[PDB]
């Protein structure tokens, strides 16, 4: 969950040329962003350690991305060349006992069901 293996598949490019970033998303919204650099020659595999926070019953998702450190003839600083995402933790589902009532009215052509301020 905290350990990730990066593999450089460029023929003639070191991964040091790119700005690394990782983000953690709680139920879709983010909560933690960090930048990093990683040295890896063409072909090489390198490990990446990501400290994780204590996590409540929400659903957590990591996203790891590389971008352009500075402008290029074909694109501007920050442009994203590669990303991958992973489920950290699934969510805990709640189930709630409902005590409140529901009415019902039958007529020739309709069944009517009332609950709070909604009629079906």
């Amino acid at each position: 969950k905290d350990t990730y293996e990066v593999e450089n598949r460029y023929l003639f490019t070191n991964l040091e040329m790119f700005d690394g970033a990782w983000k953690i998303r709680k139920d879709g919204e983010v909560i933690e962003e960090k930048t990093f650099k990683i040295f890896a020659e063409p072909g090489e595999k390198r490990l990446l350690k990501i400290p994780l926070p204590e996590m409540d019953d929400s659903e957590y998702f990591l996203e790891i991305s590389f971008s352009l450190s500075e402008d290029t003839p074909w694109a501007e600083k920050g442009h994203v060349v590669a990303w991958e995402q992973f489920l950290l933790k699934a969510p805990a589902f709640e189930k709630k006992s409902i005590s409140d009532g529901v009415s019902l009215r039958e007529d020739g052509k309709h069944l009517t069901v009332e609950a709070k301020d909604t009629v079906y």
Partner: protein
Amino acid sequence: EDWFKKEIFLHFEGVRSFFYLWVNGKKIGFSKDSCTPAEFRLTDVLRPGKNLITVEVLKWSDGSYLEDQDMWWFAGIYRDVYLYALPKFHIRDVFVRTDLDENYRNGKIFLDVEMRNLGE
């Protein structure tokens, strides 16, 4: 004379297989199915006292192509005919349905009443 403060209808219960209708020389229309009724409103083309009803009946029609039952081919006004009068404002159609509870004990009645106005 007391019929003309009301709406008058000419009802054929059955005719096989096609027929035209004239009233007092004039052409009211036609009808094709041999086993359901034909009804005409005649309040406008009818006069107090003596009135002439003329009916032309054909044995074979395009309606015969759907009446190829394993049975004798007959023809002619083979069910009752009659006139009757309703108030200007009258009950055109009724649909009565009935439900029964899960135990088949208690009942519900579902009533549709269609009304029709003609100058009331």
